[PDB]
Amino acid sequence: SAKSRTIGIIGAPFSKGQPRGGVEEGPTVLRKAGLLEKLKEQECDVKDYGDLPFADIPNDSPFQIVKNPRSVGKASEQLAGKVAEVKKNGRISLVLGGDHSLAIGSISGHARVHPDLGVIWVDAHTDINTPLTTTSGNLHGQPVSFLLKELKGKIPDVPGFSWVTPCISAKDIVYIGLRDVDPGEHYILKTLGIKYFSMTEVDRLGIGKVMEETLSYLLGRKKRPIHLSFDVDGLDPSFTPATGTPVVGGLTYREGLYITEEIYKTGLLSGLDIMEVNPSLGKTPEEVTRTVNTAVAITLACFGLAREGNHKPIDYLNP
Amino acid sequence: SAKSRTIGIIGAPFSKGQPRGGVEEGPTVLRKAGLLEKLKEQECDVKDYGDLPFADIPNDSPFQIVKNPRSVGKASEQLAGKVAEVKKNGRISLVLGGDHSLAIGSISGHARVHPDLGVIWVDAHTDINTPLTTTSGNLHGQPVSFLLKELKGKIPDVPGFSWVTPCISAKDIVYIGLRDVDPGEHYILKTLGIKYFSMTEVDRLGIGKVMEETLSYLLGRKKRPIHLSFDVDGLDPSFTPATGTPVVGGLTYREGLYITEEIYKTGLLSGLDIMEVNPSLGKTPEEVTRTVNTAVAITLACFGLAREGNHKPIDYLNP
Amino acid sequence: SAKSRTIGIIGAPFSKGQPRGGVEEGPTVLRKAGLLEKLKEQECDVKDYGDLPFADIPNDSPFQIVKNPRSVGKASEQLAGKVAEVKKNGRISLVLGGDHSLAIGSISGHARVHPDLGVIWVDAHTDINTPLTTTSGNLHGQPVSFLLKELKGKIPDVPGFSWVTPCISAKDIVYIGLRDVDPGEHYILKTLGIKYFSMTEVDRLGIGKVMEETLSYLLGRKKRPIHLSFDVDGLDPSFTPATGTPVVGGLTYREGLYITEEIYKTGLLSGLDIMEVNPSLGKTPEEVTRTVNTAVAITLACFGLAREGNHKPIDYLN
Ligand SMILES: [NH3+][C@]1(C(=O)O)[C@@H](CCC[B-](O)(O)O)C[C@H]2[NH2+]CC[C@H]21
Ligand SMILES: [NH3+][C@]1(C(=O)O)[C@@H](CCC[B-](O)(O)O)C[C@H]2[NH2+]CC[C@H]21
Ligand SMILES: [NH3+][C@]1(C(=O)O)[C@@H](CCC[B-](O)(O)O)C[C@H]2[NH2+]CC[C@H]21
Ligand SMILES: [Mn+2]
Ligand SMILES: [Mn+2]
Ligand SMILES: [Mn+2]
Ligand SMILES: [Mn+2]
Ligand SMILES: [Mn+2]
Ligand SMILES: [Mn+2]
């Protein structure tokens, strides 16, 4: 099958990057919804690399305020190795999360095979706090800081992260859907001159102009691999309520679909993260199903499913 | 009253174009909501042609997998006759559906008086399956195929449809709202080069550009009569949930009103279909009322009701 | 603090501009939600001028069909005095409503100190009926008529309003959010040539172009003070349901924030009204909380809170 429809699925049932239990069930609920079957139904070559085994680290003391550092660092180290393996096999890595701390391992692993990659980060949050600027101490709100080359010398020696080498420059990342950014994060975003489309820019320009500007900024100079790190809380809680850090006034279901349809069309999607789906956090059974169905729809759009329709290269009027 | 506010109401209580009971009650619920009274309140000349009886056809076996062919064909044949009568009386035909298979009759009969008409098709679906590409066998998913000149030779001899002569060319129809298209339908849409604005184009351009492009595409060469075939499932199920085939990520209430406000302003609306309102498909009594109210609001906008306001040509400061 | 973050808060617990009880509780629910504390948390210099006492006028007979005229006129007269005082102290007046009839007093008071002010009116409605074009007789739908210079000779001698001097020209007001306008109001809007962006223009242009056009229409010739009169029913009832006159197909939560973020950025916000919050009109306790939280978010955006983020002028990395 086509490169843009050749996929390597990695389950990452990890929750210790944040304090809310349940996000480790994200891979289970996405698989039960029939993600793999639905992808095969749209002419995808799907290989399931299974769920990564995350061994318990019982004596995981905090680094200052930073919680579960060895567990988070090890999970990302393991994921980096697995993503690099998937990438070497000529497949688009599809990481089923799990909390967003896992992006450390997902992007690190992807950069080992494709160092020229560009990142599209769909989230309500920047996730760029350092272990020193964080007030929460949750590593799911810090993955971008460990990855950026410009933040080298600002990341202290955190236990479990000695394997980390910053793999992306501030110019190689574009944020979409921002609406809840810490002061420390806003300082970083502005001082490093990172490209971003907060909800203010989405409202001003429309998602059409947002995507036109995002893809031109990342691909204008030359075609390069795209890594889409999708936090379901990027979309409004009316679509993805079963998530840990929901923020009102989010991207619509349509905008989420549009972003992913435009990324598919480039033929350059090389890595994908579907993060922060927490089935324990739906106020009703319907809120869980709604979140899972939305996450599945986003994923299908990444691999070719289009709202105008799709057809096989045959003559439907003369079978 | 003005030509654009002179109306002939036709109730078409018909459901056999699809399997879900209740759509035949659409004319009853739209009338009970006060549609006729509300139209007269906004300076409309309204004539009620009543509800078509549609006598039972007990012996109506399927054409291959195509269900109730004689019932669907005869209902459309009689509707074509009724619409032609309304059009001859110098009135805009307002068809209260009923399932969308009735568009065969509505457009066919409208073309008998105005063969130069253009079609705006608001729907989540293309409804362009032929009796041979259809997988469901439901004729409400095939009306466009029976109407298109370019599909002549691809429509088999279906019982109840010998009266049908394709009346519109692929170039005289514009779709708005698409989001659930069958492979066969997508093949047709692309091969015939039909103009369409799926939810992807609406997201990219905005409804303003969509309407500017739709009206210029249909009216640019010369002014001609407009036929708007409105399937309530074109709007998001958060506005029109009481419908047979709902699809998430639909046109908003605002977008639905914008489309219809722009069509009214041309002064060229000549035929209108308000289809697929099913008052047995409300999960609560409020979902039915919500669907009916939305359908009524769309209809009022077609006949001049504007969000900015309306006033009579009198001095309001000196009565 | 910066001029754009230096505020004078005025509570206006008044409901007699309309028939639905509960809108007088708007200042109480907005204060309980922590509005003052949240503003101080985003580096605002906040001075609380308290809640205005509105004394009962027992024999307040109607002027034709126009209800509670002396009560509405007196409440606006008091508010005008208070807003002018806040403006003289070099602060942005922040009026917590209360029904929209209070805009007579808030804009009148503001024009006394800044006669060159420009009005942005966010609402589903025009509120431009005169005491003679009104059909409901509710004064919360007539404040713009009392304020416009072009409507002088058109407004009759209404008891409680002899203090009113029209302070704004038809060219100095921009409407955003219009979707339920009376025939008489539409006639006024068209005959006076007032600038407006009904929901039809918002749908056509997008909120980005709406704001670009609104700010250029008002500020193009030169910088001048901005008065934003925000009616919570300007936003869709899915965001602000606890309100007296809700109309479907309204401005989104995002559009409301975008309008207010753009106004903040000019540094010219000089007067603000947060009106028509009615906590007695929520179908559930959550509907009230949702309306109050939305109104608080709009207010915070007016004084600098930005969705991209905010930071203090310090080195966060050192
Ligand atoms: N900046 C945050 C942090 O925890 O660092 C966000 C982290 C969000 C992480 B996520 O979902 O994007 O991966 C959540 C916010 N709430 C108070 C702390 C704030
Ligand atoms: N294209 C369809 C068909 O029945 O052929 C749709 C028909 C749409 C009918 B309507 O509402 O636009 O009139 C319903 C879908 N479900 C599976 C088959 C699909
Ligand atoms: N124009 C109105 C009026 O009462 O004059 C509106 C007044 C709304 C005032 B408000 O909420 O914008 O401040 C309410 C409408 N319903 C029938 C009469 C109409
Ligand atoms: Mn997030
Ligand atoms: Mn995140
Ligand atoms: Mn249809
Ligand atoms: Mn449909
Ligand atoms: Mn108002
Ligand atoms: Mn209003």
In sequence order, the 6+-apart residues with CB closer than 8 A to the CB of C76 are: C101, C102, C104, C105, C106, C108, C161, C164
b or e along B71-83 (b: 16 or more beta carbons within 10 Å of the residue's beta carbon)?
bbbbbbbbbbebb
In whole angstroms, give the CA distance from residue B109 to residue B253: 30
Q: Judge whether B233 and B247 are in contact, CB under 8 Å.
A: yes
- Here the tokens at position A57 are 């680290």
- Here the tokens at position A297 are 């729809």
List the resolution, Å: 1.8
Q: Judge whether C18 and C244 are in contact, CB under 8 Å.
A: yes
Q: Is B100 a catalytic residue?
A: yes
Domains in chain A, start-ordered, CATH in brackets?
A: 1-319 (3.40.800.10)
Long-range contacts, stretch A313-316, CB < 8 angstroms, 24+ apart: A315/B187, A316/B133, A316/B183, A316/B184, A316/B187, A316/B188
Among C75, C150, C130, smallest CA distance to C106 is for: C75
In whole angstroms, give the CA distance from residue C160 to residue C158: 6
Handedness of CA B293, B294, B298, B304 (dihedral sign): positive
SS3 label, residue B272: strand
Is residue A273 lining ligand 1, measured as CB closer than 6 Å?
Answer: no
In whole angstroms, give the CA distance from residue A279 to residue A23: 7
In whole angstroms, give the CA distance from residue A237 to residue A248: 6
In whole angstroms, give the CA distance from residue B248 to residue B180: 10
Among B256, B290, B30, B118, smallest CA distance to B9 is for: B30
Q: Which residues of A touch C260 (CB under 8 A)?
A: none
Among B318, B311, B43, B260, smallest CA distance to C126 is for: B311
Q: Judge whether B92 and B8 are in contact, CB under 8 Å.
A: yes
In whole angstroms, give the CA distance from residue A296 to residue A242: 14
Query: If you take atom 12 of ligand 3, which residue's CA is the nearest one?
Result: C125
The identity of residue B36, as a single letter, is L
Among B14, C52, B318, B203, smallest CA distance to A306 is for: B203
Among C296, C153, C179, C152, smallest CA distance to C233 is for: C179
Q: Judge whether B68 and B139 are in contact, CB under 8 Å.
A: yes
Query: If you take atom 16 of ligand 1, which residue's CA is the nearest one?
Result: A245
Q: Tokens 């989420």 — which residue?
A: A256
What is the phi/psi pair of residue B92, to 5°?
A: -80, 125
In whole angstroms, give the CA distance from residue A42 to residue A311: 9
DSSP string covering chain C: --GGGEEEEEE----TTSS-TTGGGHHHHHHHTTHHHHHHHTT-EEEEEEEPP----TT---BTTB-SHHHHHHHHHHHHHHHHHHHHTT-EEEEE-S-GGGHHHHHHHHHHH-TT-EEEEESSS-----TTT-SS--GGG-HHHHHBGGGTTTS---TT-TT----B-GGGEEEEEE----HHHHHHHHHHT-EEEEHHHHHHH-HHHHHHHHHHHHHSSS---EEEEEEGGGB-TTT--SSSS--SS-B-HHHHHHHHHHHHHHT-EEEEEEE---TT--SSHHHHHHHHHHHHHHHHHHTT--TT----SS-TT-
Burial grade of C172 (CB within 10 A; 0-12, 13-18, 19 or more): buried
- Here the tokens at position B87 are 């059009």
* Chain A touched by B190 (CB under 8 Å): yes
Peptide bond into A81 cis (omega under 30): no
The gap from C-alpha B229 to its chain's centroid, in whole angstroms, comes to 2
Cα of first residue to Cα of last residue in chain C, in angstroms, is 24
SS3 label, residue A275: strand
Beta-carbon-side half-sphere exposure of residue C94 (alpha carbons within 13 Å) = 28
Is residue A141 lining ligand 1, measured as CB closer than 6 Å?
Answer: yes
Task: Output DSSP code: residue A53.
Answer: P
Task: Output DSSP code: residue A19.
Answer: S
Query: Secondary structure of chain B: what % helix, strand, coil (to 5)?
Result: 40, 15, 40
Q: Judge whether A94 and A9 are in contact, CB under 8 Å.
A: yes
Our CA-based measurement puts residue B313 at a distance from the nearest CA of chain C, in whole angstroms, of 9
Q: Tokens 């966010």 — which residue?
A: C122
Taking one residue from A and the other from C, the number of pairs with CB-CB distance under 8 angstroms is: 73
In whole angstroms, give the CA distance from residue C80 to residue C64: 25
Q: Which residue of C has its CA nearest to B258?
A: C200
Residues with C-beta less than 6 Å from any ligand 2 atom? B 100, 123, 125, 127, 129, 134-136, 138, 140-141, 182, 231, 233, 244-245, 276
In whole angstroms, give the CA distance from residue B273 to residue A5: 40
- Here the tokens at position A246 are 């929901």
Helices C253-266 and C207-219 cross at an angle (nearest 10°) of: 30
Neighbours of C244 (CB within 10 A): 23
Q: In what order do the strands lie in the sheet with B269-275?
A: B45-51, B6-11, B92-96, B269-275, B226-231, B118-122, B173-178, B195-198
Task: Output DSSP code: residue A148.
Answer: B
Task: Output DSSP code: residue B16.
Answer: T
Our CA-based measurement puts residue C160 at a distance from the nearest CA of chain B, in whole angstroms, of 22
Q: Judge whether C83 and C105 are in contact, CB under 8 Å.
A: yes
What are the distances in angstroms from CA A121 to CA A84, A222, A228, A301? 20, 20, 6, 16
Query: Secondary structure of chain A: what % helix, strand, coil (to 5)?
Result: 40, 15, 40
Burial grade of A53 (CB within 10 A; 0-12, 13-18, 19 or more): exposed
* Chain C touched by A206 (CB under 8 Å): yes
Breaks (C-N over 2.5 A) in chain C follow: none
> Does B137 count as an annotated binding residue?
yes
Handedness of CA B236, B239, B243, B244 (dihedral sign): positive
Stretch (H or E) spanning B120: strand B118-122
Is residue A16 lining ligand 1, measured as CB closer than 6 Å?
Answer: no
Is residue C273 lining ligand 3, measured as CB closer than 6 Å?
Answer: no
SS3 label, residue B173: strand
Q: In what order do the strands lie in the sheet with C173-178?
A: C45-51, C6-11, C92-96, C269-275, C226-231, C118-122, C173-178, C195-198
In whole angstroms, give the CA distance from residue C294 to residue C297: 5
Q: Judge whether B52 and B10 are in contact, CB under 8 Å.
A: yes
> Which position among B51, B99, B127, B185 bears the catalytic label?
B127
Beta-carbon-side half-sphere exposure of residue A64 (alpha carbons within 13 Å) = 14
CA B299 – ligand 9 centroid, Å? 24
What are the distances in angstroms from CA C48 to CA B299, C24, C26, C82, C227? 50, 18, 16, 12, 19
- Here the tokens at position B277 are 């309102």
Q: Tokens 């006669």 — which residue?
A: C115
Beta-carbon-side half-sphere exposure of residue B81 (alpha carbons within 13 Å) = 9
Q: Which residue of C has its CA nearest to A175?
A: C308
- Here the tokens at position C29 are 């629910």
Give B51's strand partners.
B11
R_g over Cα of chain B: 18
b or e along C247-276 (b: 16 or more beta carbons within 10 Å of the residue's beta carbon)?
bbbbbbbbbbbbbbbbbbeeebbbbbbbbb
In whole angstroms, give the CA distance from residue A242 to residue C80: 48
- Here the tokens at position B153 are 């030779």
In whole angstroms, give the CA distance from residue B112 to residue A65: 78
Give C118's strand partners.
C226
Q: Judge whether B109 and B79 are in contact, CB under 8 Å.
A: yes
> Which position among A60, A140, A180, A262 bears the catalytic label?
A140
The gap from C-alpha B274 to its chain's centroid, in whole angstroms, comes to 5
Burial grade of A28 (CB within 10 A; 0-12, 13-18, 19 or more): middle
In whole angstroms, give the CA distance from residue C125 to residue C185: 9
Q: Judge whether C250 and C233 are in contact, CB under 8 Å.
A: yes
Long-range contacts, stretch C136-139, CB < 8 angstroms, 24+ apart: C136/C65, C137/C62, C137/C64, C137/C65, C137/C66, C137/C67, C138/C17, C138/C18, C138/C19, C138/C67, C139/C16, C139/C17, C139/C18, C139/C66, C139/C67, C139/C68, C139/C69, C139/C72, C139/C99, C139/C101
Q: A130, A204, A236, A253: best mutation site toward chain C, by most C Cβ within 10 Å?
A: A204
Q: Do B198 and A308 touch (CB under 8 A)?
A: yes
The identity of residue A253, as a single letter, is Y
Peptide bond into B98 cis (omega under 30): yes
In whole angstroms, give the CA distance from residue B185 to residue B145: 9
The identity of residue C99, as a single letter, is D
Q: In what order do the strands lie in the sheet with A118-122?
A: A45-51, A6-11, A92-96, A269-275, A226-231, A118-122, A173-178, A195-198
DSSP string covering B204-236: HH-HHHHHHHHHHHHHSSS---EEEEEEGGGB-
Q: Judge whether C109 and C79 are in contact, CB under 8 Å.
A: yes
Q: Is C140 a catalytic residue?
A: yes
Give B271's strand partners.
B93, B227
SS3 label, residue B190: helix
Beta-carbon-side half-sphere exposure of residue C257 (alpha carbons within 13 Å) = 25
The CA dihedral of C28, C32, C36, C40, to the nearest 10 degrees, is 180
